[PDB]
Design a protein around this ligand. Sequence first.
Ligand SMILES: [Ca+2]
Ligand SMILES: [Zn+2]
Ligand SMILES: [Zn+2]
Ligand SMILES: [Zn+2]
Ligand SMILES: [Zn+2]
Lengths: 62, 64
Amino acid sequence: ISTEEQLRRLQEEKLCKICMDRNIAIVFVPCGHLVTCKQCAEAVDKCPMCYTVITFKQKIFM
Amino acid sequence: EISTEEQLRRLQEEKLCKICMDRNIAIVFVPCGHLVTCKQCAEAVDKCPMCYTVITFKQKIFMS
Ligand SMILES: [Ca+2]
Ligand SMILES: [Zn+2]
Ligand SMILES: [Zn+2]
Ligand SMILES: [Zn+2]
Ligand SMILES: [Zn+2]
C-alpha cells in the first residue's frame, strides 16, 4: 500500500462518524469512544458505536 | 506537514503517548481535554503534563 493511500486512510479515520466533514473533537463519557465533531455531538444522546447513554461530552485536544 | 511522507508520519505519531511514544494514547484528561498519555504514563500525573490543569478524571478512550 502506497504512502498516499495510507495517508488517505488515516485522514478518513479522523473524520466525524456522523457528518464525515469535520474531524472528531469529542469523547463520550463513560464509554470513551471518539465518534463526533463538536457540532454533531449535539444530536446524540447514545453513543452511535456502543449505544451507551452519554453522561458527558468532553472536548478533546491533540 | 511538508510532504505526503511527513504528513503520514505525523498522523501515525499523533496516535502515540506523548511521554513514552511506545503505545497509543488511551486516556483523555478531564477537564482540560488533552490526549497525552497511555494508561501507564497517566498513572503518575495529577496535573496535565501539557497545560498543568488539575486532573479531576482520567477517562479511558479507544484509539486505534
Ligand atoms: Ca520507543
Ligand atoms: Zn460531525
Ligand atoms: Zn461508545
Ligand atoms: Zn506512555
Ligand atoms: Zn491539559
